[PDB]
Design a protein around this ligand. Structure first.
Ligand SMILES: *[C@@H]1O[C@H](CO)[C@@H](O[C@@H]2O[C@H](CO)[C@@H](O[C@@H]3O[C@H](CO)[C@@H](O)[C@H](O)[C@@H]3O)[C@H](O)[C@H]2NC(C)=O)[C@H](O)[C@H]1NC(C)=O
Ligand code: NAG
Ligand code: NI
Lengths: 4, 257
């Protein structure tokens, strides 16, 4: 996704 | 990388989510290496992947290298190309449009007290279907929007929403042996008043209805679980994401035998  | 996380992700089958909320417990985590470290808790709303990843970001961060002090401060971020050549914090580049200056982008927040008074950052992000612009509200008050004109993948809705904590370890331990704190600096098992939480874990579906996903609908990410971790606590009204930790002390001592 976006933040991981 | 030198980033560590305690985050949950909600993956939708297509890019039709029309918004999301996050109510984030505020703390002032300590940094072991303030020259370059940071610690934050945020939401990430995204569409696409790789160089077509678009994000909408908002939360609190302790980042002395950027803000000039160790207080938790409200921040925003975005990217339209997977952080390759676009995007920035706050209003340092053209992108976000602030419409109401009642709340300042970058404002200091009041940190919660361990075992005492708690403070929360309520943020609500909502796509306007007439334009594709994504509007930001703090504690119900409008701030501004990320316009559709800066994006290519998230103009019609988002496919993913993530919530939680992140630290940046400038000392080069991979975030595995730094006492830079995440959340309150205490493990999620300590619970309300001691460990940090994210609540109001809600998204807006294609039709405009608010959905609160059940605990099983999220995928968890905690790559340094002895340092920072997460735990869902289901209340009788809403689901909590407890997250964070004290980080790991550098107490390894291996030698060949
Ligand atoms: C969680 O996210 C939901 C969905 O975005 C938020 O709900 C939205 O909240 C606003 C403010 O209460 C509502 O706006 C109002 O709309 C009415 C018309 O229905 C208008 O007369 C008012 O002046 C105002 O603009 C909006 O309808 C509502 N949307 C939905 C789908 O329920 C909610 O605020 C978020 N919760 C938190 C705590 O962040
Ligand atoms: C996305 O998926 C939902 C649920 O499967 C569906 O209702 C919707 O029509 C799809 N497409 C768009 C553009 O929202
Ligand atoms: Ni060995």
């Amino acid at each position: 996704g976006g933040g991981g | 990388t030198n980033h560590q996380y305690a985050v949950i992700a909600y993956f939708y089958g297509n890019a039709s989510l029309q918004g999301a909320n996050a109510t984030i417990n505020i703390w002032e985590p300590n940094l072991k290496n303030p020259n370059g470290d940071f610690s934050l808790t945020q939401i990430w709303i995204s569409a696409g992947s790789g160089s077509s990843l678009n994000t909408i970001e908002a939360g609190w961060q302790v980042y002395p290298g950027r803000t000039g002090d160790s207080q938790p401060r409200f921040f925003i971020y975005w990217t339209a190309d997977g952080y390759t050549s676009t995007g920035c914090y706050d209003l340092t580049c053209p992108g976000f449009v602030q419409t109401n200056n009642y709340y300042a982008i970058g404002m200091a927040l009041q940190p919660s007290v361990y075992g005492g008074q708690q403070y929360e950052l309520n943020e609500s992000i909502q796509r306007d279907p007439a334009t594709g612009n994504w509007w930001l509200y703090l504690w119900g008050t409008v701030v501004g929007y990320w316009p559709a004109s800066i994006y290519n993948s998230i103009t019609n809705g988002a496919d993913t929403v993530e919530w939680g904590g992140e630290i940046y370890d400038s000392s080069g331990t991979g975030g595995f042996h730094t006492t830079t704190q995440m959340g309150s600096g205490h493990f999620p098992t300590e619970g309300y008043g001691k460990a940090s939480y994210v609540r109001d874990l809600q998204c807006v579906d294609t039709y405009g209805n608010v959905i609160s996903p059940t605990a099983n609908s999220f995928q968890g990410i905690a790559p340094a679980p002895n340092c920072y971790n997460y735990q869902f606590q289901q209340g009788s009204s809403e689901l909590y994401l407890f997250y964070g930790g004290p980080g790991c002390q550098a107490i390894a001592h291996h030698h060949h035998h």
